[PDB]
RNA sequence: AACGAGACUCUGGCAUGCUAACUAGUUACGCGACCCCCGAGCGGUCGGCGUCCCCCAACUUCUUAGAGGGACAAGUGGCGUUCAGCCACCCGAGAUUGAGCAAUAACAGGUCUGUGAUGCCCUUAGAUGUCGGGGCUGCACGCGCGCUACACUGACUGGCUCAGCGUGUGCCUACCCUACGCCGGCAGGCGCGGGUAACCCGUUGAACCCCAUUCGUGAUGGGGAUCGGGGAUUGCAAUUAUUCCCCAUGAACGAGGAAUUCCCAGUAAGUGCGGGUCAUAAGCUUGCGUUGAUUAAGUCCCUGCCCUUUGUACACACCGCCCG
C-alpha cells in the first residue's frame, strides 16, 4: 500500500505447507526491530539468514 | 489373374511394357457404408 | 617455417592463388556442370573451386602418410539430407579427385610412392614451407 | 560375444529382453628353445579344458 | 543506382527484376535452380546481380543457349528428357510445352489402358504407396440407429 | 543414505569383542587386520563393515557396561 | 573438440607442478598449488562422470517411450 | 505474415540520407538500416563495405553471422 | 587484473550490487570472475551449490532453449560477446552494471500461488526468495530476445542488448518489466 | 528358526605401487635422409616439423589384463533415550554409478502357428501332406507408435577439425570386410592385394559443432509431398513402380483445440555410428560415443501403493448387493 518497501530477514525455518508442499512457513525478524517477529509464507527455496522484500507486514500467516 | 484369363489384343503401341499391366487382378473397389466397430462408438447390445 | 605454425584458413587462400598464377594445373572440361558430391543439392558458387581443392589436397599429404583417391573423398564427405528420411553420412565424388591428384603429379609435386599411396615430392615439400613463411610475412604471426 | 534377444516367446505382455555374454580370453608366452623339449613338456601337465596351439615360428 | 527497369515479361511467365538472376529464371517451368546456374555460365555473364540489370541483348542470348543446349555443349544426361519416347531425340521442354507433353503421356497410358492410366483416371496413387491411411479430402462416417 | 547395519554384523561383532577383547585398539585399520586373522570374513566389503562396528562398540565399552 | 581442451589444460597444470616436485623444494610448488586449486575447475582433479548404460524401453537411459491407454 | 516494403537498389533520398545518418547514429548494423529506411538488408551489407573504404564508419567487430560498425570512433 | 581475470576485456571491478537483499545470490567478482563462462559440469548436486556459479554463466545457460538450440553452448557464447559489445557502444557503461540492474529490476516483490478450497480456484499471495527472484529475472528477459528474433531481420544479439536496456531503466518496452508488474497486480487483488 | 530384503555377481570411479609386453607404446639416442632459415648462427651445429631408419638401447607413465590395496558413518562438530541412527564439515572417490539375480499365493492372462512337448476330436487319395499364378500393399472413413517440417539461434556453398561399442570371406550349401591402380557427373564398372583378425579394412582422417562467402522476413532459395522422363545394381523373375542415382514438377505446413506422455546428472534435449533382420533394403528395435541445459532437494492435492484402527445386508468380493 502506502507503506514504503520493507526488508526483513529469516531467523529460522519452520516447515513446509500448502497442498503440495509448495509454501514454506518461516519466522522472520524485522531487521529494524530485533524483538519484533512475524510468521510468513514464502514460495521459493530458502535456507536461513537471507533477506526478503516485504511490501507489507500487515499481512500475517496462520495456515496453508 | 487368379482364376480368369482376361484376353487382350496386342498393339504396336504397347511395346516395351509387360503383359501383366493390361490385366488387373482385383476389383477396383466400391464402398461402403461404415460398419459397426468402424469407430469409437460401436458397442453394447444386452 | 613448418606449415603447422600458421593458420590453415589463411594457408589455402594464398596457396590456391599461387598455383593459378604459374600456369599450373591442367583442369578437366567438366567444372561448370559438376555437383561435386552426392550429398550436395547444388553446384558451388565458386568459379575456381578446382584451384582451392588442390591446395587442401597437397596440405593433408604433408601431415599424414599419404593415401589414394578413396581416402581423399572420405576426408571431404559430409552429411546427406535425404529429405523426409533421417540424414546420414556419405562420400562425395571420385572422378574429380582422380583428376586433381594426376594434375598435381604432372607438375611433380606428388608422385606414386610405395606403400599404397601417393606421397608429396621433396620439390613439393619445399614449395609448401616456402609460402608458409609468406603467410607470416604478410599479416604478422 | 553379445546376444540381445527376446525373453518372451510369442511376444505378449511388457516388452523385455535378455543380455547374455561370453568372455573369451587369449594370452601367449613366447619361448625360443629347441622345438623338441617344448612339444614334449607342453602337451602334458594340463588338468582343465583349456586349449593350446603351438606355432613353428612367428619372429 | 541502376534505376533503368524492373519487372518484365519473357516467354510464357512474367519474371521480376526484384530477384537475383538465377533464382528469378526458375519460375519458368522446366527450369530448376540447378539448370540455371549452368546456363548462365555457358552464357558467360554475372549471376551476382539482379535480373532487372540485364539488357535486352543479353537476355536474347539466354533463351538461345537454353533452347539448344546440346549445341552449346550442355550434356545429354543433364536434360529433362532423353529419348522422349516415340519422338527419337533428347529434348528440353519449357513452360507451356511441358504441360502439353505431360498431358500426352497420361492419354497414352489410357490409350493402351495399362495399370497406370486406370490409376490416373480413378484419382489414386500411381506409385507403390498405401492408400488405406493416406488421403482424405472425406471422413464423415456414422453407424447408429 | 540409509545403510543401517543388519543383524549378521551385530551378531558377530559382539562375539568377536568378547573373545578377543585384548587384541582391540580403537583405530579402524588395526581392528580390521585383527578380524582378518582371528576369523575369516568371506567378503572384503563385509570385513570393512564388521571392523567399523567393532570400533564403534569399543568406544562405549570404555565407559559404563554394555547390555548386549 | 571440447573435452580435449580441458585435458590439455589439466595436463600442463600438473606438468609444471611435477617439475617443481622433483627438482625444486616443497615451498615453491605448495605456493603454486594454492593458486590453481583456488579457481579449481578440474585442473588438478578429474571428473568421475562418464556415460551410463542404456536399458530397453527407452531411447535414453532414463527417458522412456510413450504409453497409451487408448 | 505481413507485407513490408523494401528496395534492392538506391534512389536519391535513401542514398543522400545514407551519408548523413552516419554521424547521427552511433550504432550501425545492416539490420538497423532495414527499419530506419526501406532497404532490402543485403543492400545494406555491401553499402557499409563501401563506407569503410572511405573511413566514414569504423569496424569494431566482425563475424560470419553478425557484424558491427560504429560512427567514427570519436568522443 | 594479473591476479583476477577480467572477462577477456571487461572489468568485474567497479561492479556493485545495489541491494542488500539480493547479494549473496548475486556475485561476480569476489573471486568468481573468470575469462569465460564455462564449468567442468558441476553446478548442482546440492541446493546451495546452484548459487555459487556466476551470473554471466547462468545467463548463457538459460539462453539456449526450445529444441534446436539445446546442446550448443558454444554458439550461445557468441551471442553474449556481441551483447556486451553492443551495450557498451550503444550507451557507454561498464556493461555488467547494465545487466545487474536488469536482473534486479525484473525480479518480483510478491507472487501468487494456488490453494484448494471448495473444488474451485482460489488464490493466495505469498512472498518470494531472493534465489527465486534471480531465477525468474534470468528466465523472463531471455524469453524476450527469443521471441523478437523469431521473424525479425534483427539478430538475437541486437534484440537481447535492447532488452537489457529497457529492463535496466524501466520503461515497459521489454517483455520482462511488463510481466513483472502483471504478477504484482494480481498479488494486490487476492491477498 | 526359515524364505524375500540385505549379503552376492557384473559394471563405473582411485594407483607414476606390484606383475609384463616388436599381434601395444613411450622415451632415448645411434642416426643417416627430406624440409625451411623459420629462431642464435651461415646453410653446418644448437632449436623447431613429421616420416623412413631404428637397436643386440632404455623403460612400462600413456595402451592392454592379471594379482592386490582403498571407503568403514572412519575422524571432528551438532542432534537423538545419548541407545538404534540422523544433519553439517575435514580428508577425499562420501556413507545412493548403473545393471543382473528375487518370496508366499494367485490369474480360467498369452502361447497347440517354437517344440519329433502333449490329451481328445477331426481330416487322411477327389487329402488339411507338392509345382504354377494371385493375395496378406486392395479405400467415402476411425485410432495408436513414430519420422520430417514450419526458418535468420536458419538454409546454402566452400574451408578447418575431434570419437567410441562392434563387425568381417575359409560359415548353409555358395556366400565377407575392403585398401590401392584405372574408367565414369553419379549410381557403378574393371584390374590387383591383405585380413582366422591389439596383425588387414582402421593412427576407424563421423555428424552436430567451428571459420569465411551468398540469400533477406518474402509460403522466400523455408518445406520436399505429389508426379513425368532417363541411367545403374541385386535376382530365376522387379508390373501394383525391390533398391540406388540424374534432370524436371514444387503440395500441405507460417507452431498447433478438447486432452495427454516422459524425464532429476554426463541426466533431459540435439547429433552421428555399430549390431540385429538381410540375395537386394530401415523412418523399426538394441547398444555406443560426441555436444550438454532449465528446474526440484518437496508433498499426499490428484492417480496409486504399504501398515494400523473402524464400519459393512459385500465373499463371482463395490465393475458388489438391493427397492418400488
UniProtKB/Swiss-Prot annotation, chain A:
Main location as per UniProt: cytoplasm
Pfam families: Ribosomal_S28e
Organism: Oryctolagus cuniculus (Rabbit)
Name the record gives this protein: Small ribosomal subunit protein eS28
SUPFAM superfamilies xref list: Nucleic acid-binding proteins
Subcellular localization: Cytoplasm, Cytosol; Cytoplasm; Rough endoplasmic reticulum; Nucleus, Nucleolus
Described purpose of this protein according to its UniProt entry: Component of the small ribosomal subunit. The ribosome is a large ribonucleoprotein complex responsible for the synthesis of proteins in the cell. Part of the small subunit (SSU) processome, first precursor of the small eukaryotic ribosomal subunit. During the assembly of the SSU processome in the nucleolus, many ribosome biogenesis factors, an RNA chaperone and ribosomal proteins associate with the nascent pre-rRNA and work in concert to generate RNA folding, modifications, rearrangements and cleavage as well as targeted degradation of pre-ribosomal RNA by the RNA exosome.
PANTHER family: 40S RIBOSOMAL PROTEIN S28, SMALL RIBOSOMAL SUBUNIT PROTEIN ES28
Entry annotated with the keyword Lipid biosynthesis: no
Xref: InterPro entries: NA-bd_OB-fold, Ribosomal_eS28, Ribosomal_eS28_CS
GO molecular function: structural constituent of ribosome
Residues recorded as bearing Phosphoserine in the entry: 37
GO biological processes: cytoplasmic translation; maturation of SSU-rRNA; ribosomal small subunit assembly
Similarity-based family: Belongs to the eukaryotic ribosomal protein eS28 family.
CDD domains, alphabetized: S1_S28E
UniProtKB/Swiss-Prot annotation, chain B:
Site of covalent link Glycyl lysine isopeptide (Lys-Gly) (interchain with G-Cter in SUMO2): 11
Residues represented out of the complete protein: 98 to 143 of 145
Record-annotated membrane-spanning stretches: none
Location in or out of the cell: Cytoplasm
Assembly mode: Component of the small ribosomal subunit.
Family the entry assigns: Belongs to the universal ribosomal protein uS19 family.
UniProt-recorded name of the protein: Small ribosomal subunit protein uS19
Gene from which the chain derives: RPS15
Function statement: Component of the small ribosomal subunit. The ribosome is a large ribonucleoprotein complex responsible for the synthesis of proteins in the cell.
Curated annotation (Swiss-Prot), chain C:
InterPro entries: Ribosomal_eS19, Ribosomal_eS19_CS, WH-like_DNA-bd_sf, WH_DNA-bd_sf
Residues annotated with N6-succinyllysine modification: 140
Major subcellular site: cytoplasm
Domain of life: Eukaryota
Modified residues (N6-acetyllysine): 20, 108, 112
GO biological process terms on file: ribosomal small subunit assembly; translation
Keyword Membrane: no
Presence of the UniProt keyword Aminoacyl-tRNA synthetase in the record: no
Cysteine disulfide partners in this protein: none
One GO MF term: RNA binding
Subcellular location: Cytoplasm; Nucleus, Nucleolus
Protein keywords: Acetylation, Cytoplasm, Host-virus interaction, Methylation, Nucleus, Ribonucleoprotein, Ribosomal protein
Residues carrying Omega-N-methylarginine: 64
GO cellular component: cytosolic ribosome; cytosolic small ribosomal subunit; nucleolus
PANTHER family per the UniProt record, alphabetical: 40S RIBOSOMAL PROTEIN S19
Entry similarity comment: Belongs to the eukaryotic ribosomal protein eS19 family.
Described function: Component of the small ribosomal subunit. The ribosome is a large ribonucleoprotein complex responsible for the synthesis of proteins in the cell. Required for pre-rRNA processing and maturation of 40S ribosomal subunits. Part of the small subunit (SSU) processome, first precursor of the small eukaryotic ribosomal subunit.
Quaternary context: Component of the small ribosomal subunit. Part of the small subunit (SSU) processome, composed of more than 70 proteins and the RNA chaperone small nucleolar RNA (snoRNA) U3. Interacts with RPS19BP1; the interaction is direct and mediates the integration of RPS19 in state post-A1. Interacts with RPS19BP1.
Protein's UniProt name: Small ribosomal subunit protein eS19
Organism: Oryctolagus cuniculus
UniProtKB/Swiss-Prot annotation, chain F:
The keyword Plastid belongs to this UniProt entry's keyword annotation: no
Protein's cellular compartments: Cytoplasm; Nucleus, Nucleolus
Example of a GO cellular component annotation carried by this entry: ribonucleoprotein complex
Membrane-spanning ranges: none
GO molecular function: structural constituent of ribosome
Domain of life of the source: Eukaryota
Keyword check for Phosphoprotein: yes
Keywords, in A-Z order: Cytoplasm, Isopeptide bond, Nucleus, Phosphoprotein, Ribonucleoprotein, Ribosomal protein, Ubl conjugation
GO terms of biological process kind: translation
Main location (coarse class): cytoplasm
Modified sites of kind N6-succinyllysine: 19
Role: Component of the small ribosomal subunit. The ribosome is a large ribonucleoprotein complex responsible for the synthesis of proteins in the cell. Part of the small subunit (SSU) processome, first precursor of the small eukaryotic ribosomal subunit. During the assembly of the SSU processome in the nucleolus, many ribosome biogenesis factors, an RNA chaperone and ribosomal proteins associate with the nascent pre-rRNA and work in concert to generate RNA folding, modifications, rearrangements and cleavage as well as targeted degradation of pre-ribosomal RNA by the RNA exosome.
Homology family: Belongs to the eukaryotic ribosomal protein eS17 family.
Subunit (UniProt): Component of the small ribosomal subunit. Part of the small subunit (SSU) processome, composed of more than 70 proteins and the RNA chaperone small nucleolar RNA (snoRNA) U3.
Protein name per UniProt: Small ribosomal subunit protein eS17
Residues shown, of full length: 1 to 68 of 135
Amino acid at each position: 500500500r502506502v507503506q514504503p518497501i520493507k526488508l526483513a530477514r529469516v531467523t529460522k525455518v519452520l516447515g513446509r505447507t500448502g497442498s503440495q508442499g509448495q509454501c514454506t512457513q518461516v519466522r522472520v525478524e524485522f531487521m529494524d526491530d530485533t524483538s519484533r517477529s512475524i510468521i510468513r509464507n514464502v514460495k521459493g527455496p530458502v535456507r536461513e539468514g537471507d533477506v526478503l522484500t516485504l511490501l507489507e507486514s500487515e499481512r500475517e500467516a496462520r495456515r496453508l | 489373374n487368379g482364376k480368369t484369363f482376361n484376353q487382350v489384343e496386342i498393339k504396336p503401341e504397347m511395346i516395351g511394357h509387360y503383359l501383366g499391366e493390361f490385366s488387373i487382378t482385383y476389383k477396383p473397389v466400391k464402398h461402403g457404408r461404415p460398419g459397426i466397430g468402424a469407430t469409437h462408438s460401436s458397442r453394447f447390445i444386452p | 617455417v613448418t606449415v603447422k605454425d600458421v593458420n590453415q584458413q589463411e594457408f589455402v587462400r594464398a596457396l590456391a592463388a599461387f598455383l593459378k598464377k604459374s600456369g599450373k594445373l591442367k583442369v578437366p572440361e567438366w567444372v561448370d556442370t559438376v555437383k561435386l558430391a552426392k550429398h550436395k543439392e547444388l553446384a558451388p558458387y565458386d568459379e575456381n573451386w578446382f584451384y582451392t581443392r588442390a591446395a587442401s589436397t597437397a596440405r593433408h599429404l604433408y601431415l599424414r602418410g599419404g593415401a589414394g583417391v578413396g581416402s581423399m573423398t572420405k576426408i571431404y564427405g559430409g552429411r546427406q539430407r535425404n529429405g523426409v528420411m533421417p540424414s546420414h553420412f556419405s562420400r562425395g565424388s571420385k572422378s574429380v579427385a582422380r583428376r586433381v591428384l594426376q594434375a598435381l603429379e604432372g607438375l611433380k609435386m606428388v608422385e606414386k610412392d610405395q606403400d599404397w599411396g601417393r606421397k608429396l615430392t621433396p620439390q613439393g615439400q619445399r614449395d609448401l614451407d616456402r609460402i608458409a613463411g609468406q603467410v607470416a610475412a604478410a599479416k604478422k604471426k | 560375444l553379445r546376444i540381445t534377444t527376446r525373453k518372451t516367446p510369442c511376444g505378449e505382455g511388457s516388452k523385455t529382453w535378455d543380455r547374455f555374454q561370453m568372455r573369451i580370453h587369449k594370452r601367449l608366452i613366447d619361448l625360443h628353445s629347441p622345438s623338441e623339449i617344448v612339444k614334449q613338456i607342453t602337451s602334458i601337465s594340463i588338468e582343465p579344458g583349456v586349449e593350446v596351439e603351438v606355432t613353428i615360428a612367428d619372429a | 543506382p541502376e534505376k533503368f527497369q524492373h519487372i518484365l515479361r519473357v516467354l510464357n511467365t512474367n519474371i521480376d527484376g526484384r530477384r537475383k538472376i538465377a533464382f528469378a529464371i526458375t519460375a519458368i517451368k522446366g527450369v530448376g535452380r540447378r539448370y540455371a546456374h549452368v546456363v548462365l555460365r555457358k552464357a558467360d555473364i554475372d549471376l551476382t546481380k539482379r535480373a532487372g540489370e540485364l539488357t535486352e541483348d543479353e537476355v536474347e542470348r539466354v533463351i538461345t543457349i537454353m533452347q539448344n543446349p546440346r549445341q552449346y555443349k550442355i550434356p545429354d544426361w543433364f536434360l529433362n528428357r532423353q529419348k522422349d519416347v516415340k519422338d527419337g531425340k533428347y529434348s528440353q521442354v519449357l513452360a507451356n510445352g511441358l504441360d502439353n507433353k505431360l498431358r500426352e503421356d497420361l492419354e497414352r497410358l489410357k490409350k493402351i489402358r495399362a495399370h497406370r492410366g486406370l490409376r490416373h483416371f480413378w484419382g489414386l496413387r500411381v506409385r507403390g504407396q498405401h492408400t488405406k491411411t493416406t488421403g482424405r479430402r472425406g471422413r464423415t462416417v456414422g453407424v447408429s440407429k | 543414505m540409509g545403510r543401517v547395519r543388519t543383524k549378521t554384523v551385530k551378531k558377530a561383532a559382539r562375539v568377536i569383542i568378547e573373545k578377543y577383547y585384548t587384541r582391540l585398539g580403537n583405530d579402524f585399520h588395526t581392528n580390521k587386520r585383527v578380524c582378518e586373522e582371528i576369523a575369516i570374513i568371506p567378503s572384503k566389503k563385509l570385513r570393512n563393515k564388521i571392523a567399523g562396528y567393532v570400533t564403534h562398540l569399543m568406544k562405549r565399552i570404555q565407559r559404563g557396561p554394555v547390555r548386549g | 573438440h571440447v573435452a580435449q581442451i580441458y585435458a590439455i589444460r589439466q595436463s600442463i597444470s600438473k606438468a609444471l607442478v611435477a617439475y617443481y616436485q622433483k627438482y625444486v623444494d616443497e615451498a615453491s610448488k605448495k605456493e603454486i598449488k594454492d593458486i590453481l586449486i583456488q579457481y579449481d575447475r578440474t585442473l588438478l582433479v578429474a571428473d568421475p562422470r562418464r556415460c551410463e548404460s542404456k536399458k530397453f524401453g527407452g531411447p535414453g537411459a532414463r527417458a522412456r517411450y510413450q504409453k497409451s491407454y487408448r | 505474415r505481413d507485407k513490408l516494403n523494401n528496395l534492392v537498389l538506391f534512389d536519391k533520398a535513401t542514398y543522400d540520407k545514407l551519408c548523413k545518418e552516419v554521424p547521427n547514429y552511433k550504432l550501425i548494423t545492416p539490420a538497423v538500416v532495414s527499419e530506419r529506411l526501406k532497404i532490402r538488408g543485403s543492400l545494406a551489407r555491401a553499402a557499409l563495405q563501401e563506407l569503410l573504404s572511405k573511413g566514414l564508419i569504423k569496424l569494431v567487430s566482425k563475424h560470419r553471422a553478425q557484424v558491427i560498425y560504429t560512427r567514427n570512433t570519436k568522443g | 587484473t594479473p591476479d583476477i581475470k577480467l572477462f577477456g576485456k571487461w572489468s568485474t571491478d567497479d561492479v556493485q550490487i545495489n541491494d542488500i537483499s539480493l547479494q549473496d545470490y548475486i556475485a561476480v567478482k569476489e573471486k568468481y570472475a573468470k575469462y569465460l563462462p564455462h564449468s567442468a559440469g558441476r553446478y548442482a548436486a546440492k541446493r546451495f551449490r546452484k548459487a555459487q556459479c556466476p551470473i554471466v554463466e547462468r545467463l548463457t545457460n538459460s539462453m539456449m532453449m526450445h529444441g534446436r538450440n539445446n546442446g550448443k553452448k558454444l554458439m550461445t557464447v557468441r551471442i553474449v560477446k556481441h551483447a556486451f559489445e553492443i551495450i557498451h557502444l550503444l550507451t557507454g557503461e561498464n556493461p555488467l552494471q547494465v545487466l545487474v540492474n536488469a536482473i534486479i529490476n525484473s525480479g518480483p516483490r510478491e507472487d501468487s500461488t494456488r490453494i484448494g478450497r471448495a473444488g474451485t480456484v482460489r488464490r493466495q499471495a505469498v512472498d518470494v526468495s531472493p534465489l527465486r527472484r534471480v531465477n525468474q529475472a534470468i528466465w523472463l528477459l531471455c524469453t524476450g530476445a527469443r521471441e523478437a528474433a523469431f521473424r525479425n531481420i534483427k539478430t538475437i544479439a541486437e534484440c537481447l542488448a535492447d532488452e537489457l536496456i529497457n529492463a535496466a531503466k524501466g520503461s515497459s518496452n521489454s517483455y520482462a518489466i511488463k510481466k513483472k508488474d502483471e504478477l504484482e497486480r494480481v498479488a494486490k487483488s487476492n491477498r
